[PDB]
Symmetry: D2
Subunit: 509 residues, 4 copies
């Protein structure tokens, strides 16, 4: 009954996967914890099994990673970059089958699974350049005969906890940067994407092994809240990068702060698109649809709030209706499918409860709102009108494809409505007004970490720092100087002179 | 019997001080809370009184500061820089009386009180330049017809909590940078330095009023832990900069994390100086004496651990003893005085407690150890030998002039002994070895935020970023790109093209 | 007869000017060269006299400046910044009287004379911040045990040759930046603003002398082409900053290149405003007027070409013509005056020659074109329509208030017409079209050094780099990283390891 | 008789080379100029022939390249980076055979020919990262409602003239950076390395053609001084990067300045090693040998002057002499060979003249000094003692393996003697003294663009900017912000407000 035991899925063997897989890697492969079975959300058929990390597995792995760091931190950053370049090449070689596994185990369509691996590849190639660039300024000291330099050094062991919905590229972006910065990494992925975690780790392990480097530089301990909480409380985890829900991230951030650790938090979003009266509606309508229903509404940056000016609200909603009707639904591997299932049955129960709450909170379901009659966790992409902007269900992140539509009249109020929620990840306005565009980007504009113009809430690329404000947690990944989160700054004064301090009346010999 | 009503202290009136002072400023002066009397540590005499903030005062002041932010954030940063320049000039015009008050109320010697004001002056002129420079990169978007920009905007209200021992410069450094970054500020100083806080706030308030700006841009609510806790829990305080003990700062850090606020923590130190065998002892001995006993051992960056190579240990300890005996003790404002009192009677009890605890833990007092038989809170600067590097009392920050002296043999063990404590503020090696110097600055070297060579643990200037790692809290102030902690980053994609998204098989209108 | 000997000009003595002034400063004041008398262009009366440098004066001054450099380069940059800060304050003290001398000797209106001194004051404060920031990155070496650092050091003597039209701020921007970068300076200003050069040098000389520094750090050798050509050919002039005509600067740049010196060239402009059909016309018309007629059309950044979409050309011409008729003309020191005289009588002749040449090339004078019937060098601000965009006089820089107006239809042609001239200083479009704006700023847009949107060609502040492309010379001044032009970069590899090179089969002892 | 027509050289076919090769590439391959034969400098045998560019070929190619630029500059820089990434992979595929061609046509040993191709590969991977990073800052405008941005755009066509001695890497470093910066390129390499230029261009042309890009993006016009001069005079060549002798470079720099073009000059070197009394002589001697004789003395960074403290002078000379005698001479493809031929018989003649002249100027040949009796252009590596530091022949770059040795006593004199020559490329001190090291790196230290400590004059890596000062031409290649030389800066003010200019008394509409 395991999919991996069917000849239809023998391609999984190109990733080194078997019926039962080792979920711990620290140079060697193991796993003494519970055996977890992951399921394909398009049909709820079991794929394969992974033995997770026990507490003893975790302790062994943290110890091995930290010993490996003594070797890794001594390797010049450009030479660390060369390792990451080879990881990028190893991913390219497997991009089709790795992408297919993301689609199989996670549920997003194949082009998005392939594209997520491509993003990991691209950030490896970016990090290769960074490995010759990271550092700080030499500054002019006010003291004659002294140097003043800003040094950056690795923090040590970087723990990386990741969510189900980007089960490759979040780890990859953290891993590529943390590596060139001279850190070792320990990955605990979402339990429901355990096979992806193993497969990616097998690819990296082979590159480390081929370069005669200890594999614990990129360690893996598959587990759930038990292992994740251990990482949050473990003083040996110098930086904990956590991508996940706000509810969990809040508690992790506390536990790290309690031990004076460092955290990088990438939490929830409740992202708004705003269409002003002057917007190109031929741009707004497709932008809102794809941002709202992409990955079946399971991106951190999914559009969940759509503010439309009064004079165009009805036309935009009607055009969005005629468009949603053409969303093509199927298995995420099926060619030319735009829309697959939700990741779990629990997300379906969350979807239904949200549609119900919205309907009872005064909203009207103008499209969707129902479960589809088919195997897997399929729900209709949903649009809801008539809610107040402060409706409770619209302030909540429901990780499903529900787009709440609101009317507005004026700029100042709709900017405030963007900002009024607790999340602060992504935000978008559609307009042609030069003045409004620069106010949106200024101090009285959007309060989010991603602030877009005429591109929806998923508009991001690896060149910029990625992350959100407020309850999204403040962390940044990928571009700009995000690399500084993975290193420690020191401000260093070097007296190279023979000058003695002033004696101040004291007689020194 | 107030010092301010005596003719010798008439100069206090040049700071605008009176017998009883209002300790709340927000555009208006006030204070309905408890009236505190502050005392001169040189003679235990009361100086003057300050009416502190009630809860109502705090509430009104936070509201007024955030209303003023609407005006202040709209002022272009170079014009905010011009205000900070004028603050710098207002400080210059009062530097002698203000530095005299620092000596009087806090107890450090006059040149250090005056020096502390000069530091604030210097950061203002630094910030004037920064006000024409802050911002982020325009980056090359991978998308045709798109721009990609990193924007920086004020966080809003920056609450600033400061310690007794740098009662002017810590606030000033936060103030100048937060101001040019577009924030309004709210200051709660240490209660035992309330008159200094009032005096500084009067100088700034005149500059704001003279420029027809709302005074709440730089608000003041004097108080103790009750006001500080309110700030730590208050979602309207967008950034809380806290300078103080690790014990208090850990709870402030957790309160801010609880509400997904931002914190900048500048906490405890336990700084080591390391003298290798090849060191210039005519540099080592004065450097250690001054870093250990300056400000009566009450700098965050005070030298509290002294590692001496075993070949030179005895010579350096005996030269230190002979140098300690020549320290000139007296009233902090008197000429040629190098050593004044501890800040509080309580600190004297802490001093004796540590001296007794170190004797129990096997240490030998080779100089000092007792309270001085004279008015004020004067204790002898103390040298303790024979302790193990891992003695508990040596791992503890005792904010008193006690120097723990250790032997060592090799570089690796003594670097680890530097890093083994929970604090991570400042550190110094004295050596001529080129390779040792660059290992100390590298990944297997010092883990502190300040890493010095041939200058002691108080070597730091405003051009670099100032702060520590580990239990020192991680925040940075003053120079380099410390300014980014007072602002929020956004990654902004602007589609300026008329290109439509790919239809992906959907028939849009 | 000499204006300085008349009571109503006694304020000149506040700048330290006499009937006859020394034009050479190197610590001493001298001048064995030709005595020049400078005239007031508003009444053609002589002001005072300056004794210019002889060759012996020039030789002696270069030697004294390079000797002073030995002291000046040893002063830490932040302390060099403190000298520059004091220059800014010294200029602040004399801003009104200095701005009035600029108006008297050069002819610009008082608010622009004062504003010029203000711009020098502003770049001084900017340079104070820069003096704690200049430097290069520490970079990660690919070689184990090596450091890789980019150092920046002063080039030595920076010669500064300036033009008549900005006789304070061009020097000041070069001076303040060169000084904090550790260079000494040698100034040769325009001969017709010799009194301004002497007055500025007297202000700086006092600051240097008061700070016990050698005055040759900011040397002055007043003179004409012969002194300027000497500097161009002098190997001891490590960097020659030249501001002037394209015709002279081309020969200066060739002479410096011949000796492998460094040159910073700030040459002519032929700056265009482009108004598209969607432009805000209440913005276009005043922006065009003030940018065309400001400083009597004698700015490097003066608008000389106005491209107007065919649909709005006649309306904009008619509205400019009605606004030109209200320009208030008079003595440049009277505060109601917007429009002062041209700098010389030859300038008036060349104005008339250009008007005549425009008529011969087919152009129609729709406003102005004639000399004003009053004492001084006053001409009417002039608008010419009907020329083709490639008319020879339209491609010539004529330093007079003549605005050539052209029709256009489409964006691509009018961008090409902006770029077709040999000059490449400033350029501006007025439009609301978001895409047009970013195309103008991109690779197929303006080819100029200053590229503005909805602000005219005179829009520039000190925070950015200032300069042009093509025949404008490529130099940059003031902001961003323009400071690098005043320093020499070194890429420095430091082997701090004990490792030996590979023997490669050679037995070394 | 052609080597490519002999069967032992069939590997040259792997590079696409044949008996007679087209030396023009612009999308099509051609060449109507003179047919050049290139010769193996190890045996003077002809290898193959290249058809060089006529003037008509040049004209057509410039035109086609500027046409290609219209497409290329519209490609987002990260996507141009992907093209450069593919160039790096294509070079990897041919690195052994391309390295072998470098040894065969140019004459450097095999590890260095491969090492040269590797350097290009590394700069490609660097450029890939830079392609998501290049740009300038957003700056805070002093004007309300305005943005201030620094934009960087390609200059257009970058002509690249390269020298014989790094026939792959100098072009590749210019090409990789210029390409990601949005420029098209036109290469004219040295005529004596034409086959290498063709081989590299074939590798790039396949990548461009496989990506359906116009091949003129990387154009090739093989030829001599005629083609090179045409490039220096050609206004359509927006930037001319010239690597070669100072003698030719000076004339190129003058021709480019005459037309207000941009040049990037990488000219001659006269690089000194300085050994202080405290140096590690086990590091000094092999460092001096390999830096003096590597590449048969034909690096721009070759050590040509060796200053030794008089206390250790005789010891280092004696030890250097014993190491020189072990240098292994032979065919540069022979794996056991350290030392191959000079590039041309004219190089041998120049070598002999310089040796003859060092004797006439009072020097003593203590090792070498003779041409070797064998086929090819072999000369003995040579050591000359007893010359004055200012001997004319020692101030001359002779591109040959002659090492002039000098005594010195004190630091200040020997720093001056490093700096007294007209060249300014690389420099090295060997010392342990911390203060001497930081003085070497400061304002009174080396005046060169490369300033090294305990590593000889050839110590550089791609992460840093590479180039020299004074007669070395001032240009920079490769790392840091060298990319700025391939682009044009604009400083851009964008008024997005509806604020109108102040009327200044004028009544507008
Ligand atoms: Cl001593
Ligand atoms: Cl539609
Ligand atoms: Cl040897
Ligand atoms: Cl008008």
């Amino acid at each position: 009954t395991l999919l991996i035991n069917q000849p239809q899925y023998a391609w999984l063997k190109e990733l080194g996967l078997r019926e039962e897989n080792e979920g711990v890697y620290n140079g060697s492969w193991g796993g003494r914890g519970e055996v977890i079975t992951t399921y394909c959300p398009a049909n709820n058929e079991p794929i394969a099994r992974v033995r997770q990390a026990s507490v003893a597995d975790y302790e062994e792995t943290v110890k091995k990673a930290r010993e490996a760091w003594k070797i890794w931190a001594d390797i010049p950053a450009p030479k660390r970059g060369e390792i990451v370049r080879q990881i990028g090449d190893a991913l390219r070689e497997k991009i089709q089958v790795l992408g297919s596994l993301v689609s199989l185990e996670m549920g997003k369509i194949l082009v998005e699974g392939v594209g997520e691996v491509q993003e990991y590849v691209d950030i490896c190639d970016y990090a290769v350049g960074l490995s010759r660039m990271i550092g700080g300024p030499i500054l002019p000291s006010e003291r004659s005969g002294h140097a003043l330099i800003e040094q950056w050094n690795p923090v040590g062991l970087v723990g990386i906890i990741t969510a189900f919905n980007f089960p490759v590229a979040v780890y990859g972006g953290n891993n590529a940067i943390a590596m060139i910065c001279g850190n070792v990494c320990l990955w605990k992925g979402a339990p429901t994407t355990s096979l992806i975690s193993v497969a990616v780790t097998k690819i990296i392990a082979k590159v480390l092994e081929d370069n005669k480097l200890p594999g614990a530089i990129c360690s893996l301990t598959c587990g759930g809240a038990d292992i994740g909480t251990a990482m949050a409380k473990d003083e040996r985890v110098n930086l904990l990068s956590f991508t996940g829900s706000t509810q969990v991230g809040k508690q992790v951030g506390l536990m790290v702060q309690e031990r004076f650790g460092r955290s990088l938090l990438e939490l929830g979003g409740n992202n708004a698109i705003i269409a002003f009266e002057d917007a190109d509606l031929s741009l707004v309508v497709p932008s809102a649809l794809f941002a709202a229903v992409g990955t079946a509404g399971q991106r951190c940056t999914t559009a969940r709030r759509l503010f439309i000016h009064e004079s165009i609200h009805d036309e935009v909603v009607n055009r969005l209706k005629k468009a949603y009707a053409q969303i093509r639904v199927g298995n995420p591997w099926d060619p030319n499918v735009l829309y697959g299932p939700l990741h779990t049955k629990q997300a379906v129960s969350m979807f239904l409860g949200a549609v119900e709450e919205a309907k009872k909170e005064g909203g009207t379901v103008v499209y969707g709102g129902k479960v589809m009659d088919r195997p897997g966790n399929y729900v209709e992409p949903t649009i809801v009108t008539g809610l107040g902007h402060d409706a409770s269900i619209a302030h909540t992140e429901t990780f499903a494809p529900i787009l709440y539509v609101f009317k507005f009249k004026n700029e100042e109020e709709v900017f405030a409505w963007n900002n009024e929620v607790k999340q602060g990840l992504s935000s978008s306005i559609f307009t042609k007004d030069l003045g409004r565009i620069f106010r949106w980007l200024g101090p009285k504009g959007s309060d989010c970490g991603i602030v877009n113009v005429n591109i929806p809430t998923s508009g991001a690329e690896i060149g910029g720092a990625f992350g959100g404000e407020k309850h999204t947690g403040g962390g940044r990944e990928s571009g700009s100087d995000a690399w500084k989160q993975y290193m420690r700054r020191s401000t260093c004064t070097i007296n190279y002179s023979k000058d003695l301090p002033l004696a101040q009346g004291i007689k020194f010999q």
